[PDB]
Curated annotation (Swiss-Prot), chain A:
Upregulation: Part of the rbcL-rbcS operon, transcribed in light and constitutively during growth on fructose.
Gene name per UniProt: cbbS
Organism: Nostoc sp. (strain PCC 7120 / SAG 25.82 / UTEX 2576)
Keyword annotations of the record: Bacterial microcompartment, Calvin cycle, Carbon dioxide fixation, Carboxysome, Photorespiration, Photosynthesis
SMART domains: RuBisCO_small (SM00961)
GO molecular-function terms, A-Z: ribulose-bisphosphate carboxylase activity
Function (record text): RuBisCO catalyzes two reactions: the carboxylation of D-ribulose 1,5-bisphosphate, the primary event in carbon dioxide fixation, as well as the oxidative fragmentation of the pentose substrate in the photorespiration process. Both reactions occur simultaneously and in competition at the same active site. Although the small subunit is not catalytic it is essential for maximal activity.
Superkingdom in the source lineage: Bacteria
PANTHER family in UniProt: RIBULOSE BISPHOSPHATE CARBOXYLASE SMALL CHAIN 1, CHLOROPLASTIC
Protein name: Ribulose bisphosphate carboxylase small subunit
Subunit structure and binding partners: Heterohexadecamer of 8 large and 8 small subunits. Forms complexes of many stoichiometries with Raf1 and RbcL.
Coiled coil stretches, renumbered: none
Family: Belongs to the RuBisCO small chain family.
The keyword Lipoprotein appears for this protein: no
Location(s), subcellular: Carboxysome
Swiss-Prot record, chains B, D, E:
Compartment(s) where it occurs, according to its Swiss-Prot or TrEMBL record: Carboxysome
Gene that encodes it: cbbL
Keywords: Bacterial microcompartment, Calvin cycle, Carbon dioxide fixation, Carboxysome, Disulfide bond, Lyase, Magnesium, Metal-binding, Monooxygenase, Oxidoreductase, Photorespiration, Photosynthesis
Descriptive protein name: Ribulose bisphosphate carboxylase large chain
Organism: Nostoc sp. (strain PCC 7120 / SAG 25.82 / UTEX 2576)
Residues binding Mg(2+), per UniProt: 179, 181-182
Curated annotation (Swiss-Prot), chain C:
The family this protein is said to belong to: Belongs to the RuBisCO activase family.
Shown residues within the full chain: 326 to 411 of 414
Name of the protein described by the UniProt record: Ribulose bisphosphate carboxylase/oxygenase activase
Organism ancestry: Bacteria, Bacillati, Cyanobacteriota, Cyanophyceae, Nostocales
Function of the molecule: Activation of RuBisCO (ribulose-1,5-bisohosphate carboxylase/oxygenase; EC 4.1.1.39) involves the ATP-dependent carboxylation of the epsilon-amino group of lysine leading to a carbamate structure.
Organism, as annotated: Nostoc sp. (strain PCC 7120 / SAG 25.82 / UTEX 2576)
Length: 106, 435, 86, 435, 435
């Protein structure tokens, strides 16, 4: 028997070990493949009550390859090191977010 | 004067599919004209009062007979009912007019309603779901993945405080939701108001811990309509995002006043399908579940139990989620149903599943469904908190594998065993629930 | 095995009823939670006096009681406490 | 640990009789322990939470198995449920706990609930009938004789005014009551409020004419619980002695809040048994009507449809009227039911009867029953008013013959033909509906 | 026709034990038939209206007469009353029908009701206690030990603020509860609303200090039923876990509407037994307290005053706590009472006890009781806060000694004195209240 340690969790893909930049590339490849619109979001503090983070630039409407979304990730990581950042995927037919996962911790 | 094959159904008309088994020596035309008559403006004799009202306009009539392949005195009946004769925004009437006393007719041994089509004009009168799928994900802030629920065992026995602690350990590990059993109401051993107060202390505790929005379905089902509304006044008061109800047992009218109230107040409602197995079980007699699923979507409901797995089950699952669904006779769907922008109801999968059925249920149900483990979480060797982290890591593994582009039918047993290497809690559960 | 015990044994089995004897320790007597001991649905006096002396001795310091059961559906007719804890 | 034959049922315990058809290769002990378990504190696996609560005290258990004569893999199961685990004054729970999902079990093909016994302790929590037989005769001032009702035909078509006049001519001749059809609710062609106003003008008219108390059953059945109460507020307002409801279709919870309201206000309620034929038809599958009849008596109801005739039908008729009824296996009754001073429900006989079935139905049903003619009154050669006086004189002839001391089985055709000599209206009806 | 010895009592029947003292020259049979008659369907003359109703079924009758040993014209009467004739869920009727005007009969000088048995069928109609013992311990989070209360002295004199401070110092030391006096209502010197506001400030103060859940019984007893509910609306508003009522003086109907309200809102109710001593004092005349204790348990109540000590007191103490209690004539119990899963009421011991009666009261009353010190806490040499710590350490010493396995009858004075060595507060109180 083992007792479960207390951990502060971060929505989808947080119970898996922290993601490698290759695992990052495969999950955004899935966003552009299904035809959804990938975007970058940042916030100072992470809490269950607040449901709007500060949007980074615009949703990248013209995204051909998954590398263009990775370069937008590293430029925000450089600008705000002490911020929470996550990448989302808007769908245009069903008017809802498909995917929401957290990439950098302060 | 009830059997008219030449008739061509209109768009503002409700159409029904009956599987008929007549008494031997009864023709295929007369037993078809008898259920078309006995459901709407039908009488055993000619009465004089029929000459003042226009009988031709209001009457339901059989337009098509199809004999069932490989079956003797077994055929499908298609009857069309004018739109005007039903009352507006009430399941109670459509249920009452059609499938009233056409059942238990002396002319026929066995009868089964297979399907029911709603014209769009009739669909508009109802509220439908108080929220729907798209609305529901937005209030809870959860995307990408199927949602995870938990049923507390045993069903009746625990004190209000013991219930409060058994719920605390489960959401702590990383379950989305916890659930009350379908037969717990206001039992002498735990009164509802005490259960409602201790569950409130354990959600706020695990909310400030893990840092996510957590919930618990508070069964509201009550004998009278005052008690039901009054219990719900208390759940709103403790700021509870969700409650739940059994619609079949309380009745459609009980379920109706509730949904109006729930849209008024912005609480999400779970629906359990208690007492379904007595009507929809027999393939010769009863009403098919897909009829009752529609009736639910229209009554209103944010969640609904669909039952665990096959060709038949995906028929009425895509029927509750999609805006437009096409006629497919192999799947089990007889008519073209078109929903007028009405929000979708989320599929709930519960009843005897462990961490090895995990690859099978994410692929078939997809993304917009709730996966609920009754016996699979509590019965962990290490307790409720490790049993939860076990099922959480196993879902997130299959969802990551699916995106990258792996077939979970082929590499289904493969992704569960890789994940079992770096997490201790899944290694002891893979051992226990074997193949 | 008193004179009250064997007359009730004989009164139960003179009705066509079957005897069941049940014991309970002092704690579970609160909640009226008794259990069967020996052979159930007894239909003769000597089987009744033999498993009565089996259960007086097997659960001494517990309550023991005799049941008269109408074999039609197994309906409970008559209940009487024979032995009480010390 | 669920199958225990030695167990002897207590008096404060609810007992049930199931007709079981197992899958071949399934023993008679395991399929019996599975429905005894799956209805109450039953789980497919051993869970750890069962060791904190006392499972022995709460569990339902099978005490007696009886093999059905002349039937293979067919036997009767007797299960006993402790009193404590059900909630007080609610049919919804007793229905939900027992016959929930024991149906559609993989271990068994066909299942049928035959009967259900209520201990007196449980019977006391309910209101039961708002009035009963004795109370009902006293409000209407009618003694000696069976009461006569009438169903207006056709079912859907007539205007609110035409309905108002077709009801006026029937009570004028000498019917006690008139009745709305089971599928008329708030149809577009006649709205409920208009129908409620014109029927009010025709009762007061024929009341001041013939000099007797007349009534009409105003169908209240509505989709939501607000509408139902609000329609009823209007019937009380026009001083209507009776209304009516369909209990199966609206649900037990809908039917419950109503009966409480009806006892509060002193209006007599008629209950139609719409949609009964789909559950109770098959002799291998469903629930027997006698279970549902009890459930009605307990929910509450002053009248109930029993269906027209035989050994089975008199079983559940004497079960609804008598204070004490004895176990009789040939009649169809498995258990000794004892009602604690609860008033009786009046039998309603409707569905295809004419003036020649008149001797047969006064003798079998007796004095405390309502005889209802759908097609038999309107379809008279001379109209609604002569068709009513026809059925009135034919009842009063059989009731006078019965008192003096004549067998109506022997001299049944004799009393109808003597009466046909001095009354012109019965001479033209004897002609038409022949043998 | 009232005295019938051959009669064998049924299970669904209420049975009563009367101690009768007839006028000299009155037989033992006629005075027994007269109290059996005058309580239920009894009249001094034969009236004609008795031949329309069935008198045999409804009548209460005396079945057994037992002469009291060592007493002339003194004997115990046993009368049985059919279940039907009482109204459901009302103490008011059962009290009214039986002990109405059988008292003050000319045929007899003295009359005393000793005991009263309730059939299980009748017990189910009531709510009973709003919570019970098991429920109550769970809301307060207190286990192992008897709970400690305090009565503020003097009874009438202190201002609303002075009351607020005298309550603050007591719970600070380490008492569980504080209590209002039985004659404080809405006295001119302190209005209820002011008293209700200052006690709210002192509980929140000592709650954040010692780190435990604290309470105070707020006397709600009011002249009218509006005022009573309106004062209680205010206690719920300041989030008070407990209030209290005097049931005898306000009446049973006042106490009833309250208990329904209290279960509705989840507030624990204390009951004081004010004005008990005028009825239950005399051994020849009145009603015994055990009858009234039963009547309380059924009316509802979470606490009840039992009185300080012996063979008689433990009779009605084990009668209020236990689920099943057996007939014991030496103890004072005449009938076998069986409670249907109804929760137990906690014993309250108050009236003239100090730190030396501490060993005697933990052993006799056991674990599930409340020990209350009126004069014993305030009258400490050092004040209210040390006087509280004195009684707290003295209880915890006896509870620890009991668990290890020491007899508190032999070593009772021993444990109090070896605790007096390491705590200064008990050394000055041991000094003051000596032997």
């Amino acid at each position: 028997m083992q007792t479960l340690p207390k951990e502060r969790r971060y929505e989808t893909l947080s119970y898996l070990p922290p993601l490698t930049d290759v695992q990052i590339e495969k999950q955004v490849q899935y966003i552009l493949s299904q035809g959804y619109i990938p975007a970058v979001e940042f916030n100072e503090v992470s809490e269950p009550t607040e449901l709007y983070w500060t949007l980074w630039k615009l949703p990248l409407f013209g995204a051909k390859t998954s590398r263009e979304v990775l370069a937008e990730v590293q430029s925000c990581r450089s600008q705000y090191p002490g911020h929470y950042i996550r990448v989302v995927g808007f769908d245009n037919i069903k008017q809802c977010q498909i995917l929401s996962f957290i990439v950098h911790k302060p | 004067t009830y059997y008219t094959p030449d008739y061509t159904p209109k768009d503002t008309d409700i159409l029904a599919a009956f599987r008929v088994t007549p008494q031997p020596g009864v023709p295929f035309e007369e037993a078809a004209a008898a259920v078309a008559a006995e459901s709407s403006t039908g009488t055993w004799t000619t009465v004089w009062t029929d000459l003042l009202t226009d009988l031709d306009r209001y009457k339901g009539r059989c337009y098509d007979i199809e004999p069932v392949p490989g079956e003797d005195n077994q055929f499908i009946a298609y009857i069309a009912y004018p739109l005007d004769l039903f009352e507006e925004g009430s399941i109670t009437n459509v249920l009452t007019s059609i499938v009233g006393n056409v059942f238990g007719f002396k002319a026929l041994r066995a009868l089964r309603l297979e399907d029911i089509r709603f014209p769009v004009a009739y669909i508009k009168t109802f509220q439908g779901p108080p929220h729907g799928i798209q609305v529901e994900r937005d209030k809870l802030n959860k995307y990408g993945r199927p949602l995870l629920g938990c049923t507390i065992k045993p069903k009746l026995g625990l004190s209000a405080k013991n219930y409060g602690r058994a719920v605390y350990e489960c959401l702590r590990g990383g379950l989305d939701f916890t659930k009350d059993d379908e037969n717990i109401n206001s039992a002498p051993f735990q009164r509802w108001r005490d259960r409602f107060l201790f569950v409130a202390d354990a959600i706020t505790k695990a909310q400030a811990e893990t840092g996510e929005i957590k919930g618990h379905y508070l069964n509201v089902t009550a004998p009278t309509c005052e008690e039901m509304l009054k219990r719900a006044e208390y759940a709103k008061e403790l700021k509870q995002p969700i409650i739940m109800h059994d619609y079949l047992t309380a009745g459609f009218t009980a379920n109706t006043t509730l949904a109006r109230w729930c849209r008024d107040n912005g609480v999400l409602l779970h629906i359990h399908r208690a007492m379904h197995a007595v009507i929809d079980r027999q393939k010769n007699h009863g009403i098919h579940f897909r009829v009752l699923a529609k009736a639910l979507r229209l009554s209103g409901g944010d969640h609904i139990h669909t039952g665990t797995v096959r060709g038949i089950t995906m028929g009425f699952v895509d029927l509750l989620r999609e805006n437009y669904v096409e006629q497919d006779k192999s799947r089990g769907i007889y008519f073209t149903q078109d929903w007028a922008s009405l929000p979708g109801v989320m599929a709930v999968a519960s009843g005897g599943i462990h961490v090895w059925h995990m690859p099978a249920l994410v692929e078939i149900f997809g993304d917009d469904s709730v996966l609920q483990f009754g016996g699979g979480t509590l019965g962990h060797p290490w307790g409720n908190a490790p049993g939860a982290t076990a099922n959480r890591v196993a879902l997130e593994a299959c969802v990551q594998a699916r995106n990258e582009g792996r077939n979970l039918a082929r590499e289904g047993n493969d992704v569960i065993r890789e994940a079992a290497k770096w997490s201790p809690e899944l290694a002891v559960a893979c051992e226990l629930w074997k193949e | 095995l008193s004179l009250e015990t064997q007359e009730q044994i004989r009164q139960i089995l003179s009705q066509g009823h079957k005897i069941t004897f049940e014991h309970v320790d002092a704690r579970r007597f609160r909640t009226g939670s008794w259990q069967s001991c020996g052979t159930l649905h007894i239909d003769a006096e000597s089987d009744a006096i033999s498993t009565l002396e089996a259960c007086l001795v097997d659960y001494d310091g517990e309550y023991v009681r005799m049941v008269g059961i109408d074999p039609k559906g197994k309906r409970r007719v008559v209940e009487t406490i024979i032995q009480r804890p010390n």
